[PDB]
């Protein structure tokens, strides 16, 4: 759990974050939309990403929010997006972070057809080590891993984002969005005690979705799996809870990968693989000692 080149890049990011000091609204000029915006700090030549969460509550709670958010200045990892500061402006709290020119794996998968197995191996290593970092050094679980919160860049780093550091921010958000893709673990859906095993389940589900190019619940019939190579929220959730978990097609994916996801997608979280079991799994031992030019595949596929 240590490298040199990563040490160098983290040192450089520390140096950079030194530049900013304090933040407020007029420091920033809207460049583009990514709610999150690609923005340009003027007091310092940095391109940042600024996410604006709209909250409407009294000042004492927002002060508690920023105090809780300040912990991200302390966490630093090659597998975690960089955090710069959090301020309040005009009924919106701003989180400004490292900008990732490749975006989330949601949209890269949207433009590509499917993501090949070895790159998914690399991202699996990234995610597992990031989660291990959070659990071991800060006693926090991510609580919301999914493709849209895994970020990729043309320099070739993959990091986690949007993880659960502040209980009060969870309380303070007025309304949530529920769509047709759920990444919540079965035990969380049922309201029982949970741990980072839930994040491992969510990672498994994200991995199978990215590998097949389709959200895998409900499973497709033979016709759509053939060609690859109107549902109510409640019955999707009940499928996740009571039907057997999704699984990769047996022809086009390695045994190690199939077993890796199958171990991630075990319903009983006690029998589900934990972080270190996955750290010693055959699939990521194989993927670890491989040379893939992730930056190259990325840039070529996204046109960057």
């Amino acid at each position: 759990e240590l490298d040199e080149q990563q040490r160098k890049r983290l040192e450089a990011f520390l140096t950079q974050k030194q530049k900013v000091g304090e933040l407020k609204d007029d420091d920033f000029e809207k460049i583009s939309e990514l709610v999150v915006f690609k923005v340009s700090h003027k007091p310092s030549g940095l391109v940042m990403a600024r996410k604006l969460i709209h909250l409407e509550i009294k000042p004492a709670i927002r002060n508690q929010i920023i105090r809780e958010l300040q912990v991200l200045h302390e966490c630093n990892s090659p597998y975690i997006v960089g955090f710069y500061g959090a301020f309040y402006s005009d009924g919106e709290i701003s989180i400004c972070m490292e900008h990732m020119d490749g975006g989330s794996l949601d949209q890269v998968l949207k433009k590509a057809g499917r993501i090949p197995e070895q790159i998914l191996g690399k991202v699996s290593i990234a995610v597992i080590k990031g989660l291990t970092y959070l659990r071991e050094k800060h006693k926090i679980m991510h609580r919301d891993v999914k493709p849209s919160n895994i970020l990729v860049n043309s320099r070739g780093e993959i990091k986690l984002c949007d993880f659960g550091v502040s209980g009060q921010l969870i309380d303070s958000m007025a309304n949530s969005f529920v769509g047709t893709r759920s990444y919540m673990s079965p035990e969380r859906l049922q309201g029982t005690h949970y741990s980072v095993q839930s994040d491992i389940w969510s990672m498994g589900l994200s991995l199978v979705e990215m590998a097949v190019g389709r959200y895998p619940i409900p499973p497709p019939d033979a016709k759509e799996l053939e060609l690859m190579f109107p549902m109510a929220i409640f019955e999707l959730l009940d499928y996740i809870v009571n039907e057997p978990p999704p699984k990769l097609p047996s022809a086009v994916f390695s045994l190690e990968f199939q077993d890796f996801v199958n171990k991630c997608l075990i319903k009983n979280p006690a029998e589900r693989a934990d972080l270190k079991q996955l750290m010693v799994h055959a699939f990521i031992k194989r993927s670890d000692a491989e040379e893939v030019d992730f930056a190259g595949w990325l840039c070529s596929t996204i046109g960057l």
């Binding site: 047709t180 919540m184 309201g191 809870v241």
Partner: protein, 277 residues
């Protein structure tokens, strides 16, 4: 195609509009003067004749109501694309704020009385064949023992659900929705076609009863998807963790019953509430 303010039995000469009373998802609510009044301004599409005639159907229904536990509908003027509904102004605070005020004591007798007031109002509305469809503590007002229900019927015409392939869900909403409704929410769901009924209103009153005794909404800890699944399969909390007797919990067992036909009418519920200690 038109609704004028002279069409109403409340004589009207002038209408003044004051400050905004509060934020909300359906129109804006201002102070007004007529006595003092509450004016809800709503916006619609320039030529959606369909929903406009639906709306007039509804407000013609509302013109026949009058009951001490129901907000006084005073008048509605339409003129597209912007329409306004004018009702009496409630002195006091919402039940939502009262319940969450640490300086306010909420003993079991007082909660039973508040519940009975809400039940009388709801049974009046049901007797006239009007469904509330959005009963909740932010839509009840409490002033030193006077309890008034507001915003009945609006939810049909509300549009409070309106991202792509993603249904917007407000905190507090799902725990008022009866299982039959929860099992049908989709990113395609529309307020005017959800299967509201008298039983769903009784369910929402059950949620209010829980909130009256725990002084917080049920499922407070849980995220929205967990709440949808738990409620759709029929898992519901009780009040034994805070020492409430069997009788105060039986109200919840009845109002939250999984099959609609097992839920009581508001008349039966009024009876059940009378028989508490």
């Amino acid at each position: 195609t038109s609704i004028f303010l002279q069409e109403w039995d409340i004589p009207f000469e002038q209408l003044e509009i004051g400050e905004l009373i509060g934020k909300g998802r359906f129109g804006q609510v201002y102070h007004g003067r007529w006595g003092e009044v509450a004016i809800r301004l709503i916006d619609i599409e320039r030529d959606n004749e369909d929903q406009l005639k639906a709306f007039k159907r509804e407000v013609m229904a509302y013109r026949q109501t009058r009951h001490e536990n129901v907000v006084l509908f005073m008048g509605a003027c339409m003129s597209p694309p912007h329409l306004a509904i004018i009702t009496s102004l409630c002195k006091g605070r919402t039940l939502y704020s009262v319940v969450r005020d640490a300086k306010i004591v909420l003993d079991v007798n007082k909660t039973r009385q508040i519940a009975q007031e809400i039940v009388k109002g709801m049974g009046y509305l049901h007797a006239k064949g009007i469904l509330h469809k959005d009963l909740k503590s932010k839509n009840v007002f409490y002033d030193n023992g006077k309890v008034v229900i507001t915003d009945f019927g609006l939810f049909s015409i509300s549009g409070v659900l309106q991202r792509e392939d993603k249904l917007r869900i407000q905190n507090g909403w799902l725990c008022h929705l009866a299982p039959e409704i929860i099992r049908q929410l989709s990113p395609d769901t529309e307020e005017d076609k959800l299967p509201f009924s008298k039983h769903s209103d009784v369910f929402a009153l059950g949620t209010i009863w829980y909130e009256l005794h725990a002084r917080e909404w049920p499922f407070k800890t849980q995220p929205a998807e967990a709440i949808i699944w738990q409620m759709g399969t029929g898992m519901k909390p009780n009040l034994s963790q805070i020492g409430m007797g069997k009788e105060i919990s039986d109200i919840l067992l009845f109002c939250w019953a999984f099959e609609q036909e097992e839920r009581p009418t508001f008349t039966k519920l009024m009876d059940m509430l009378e028989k508490l200690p």
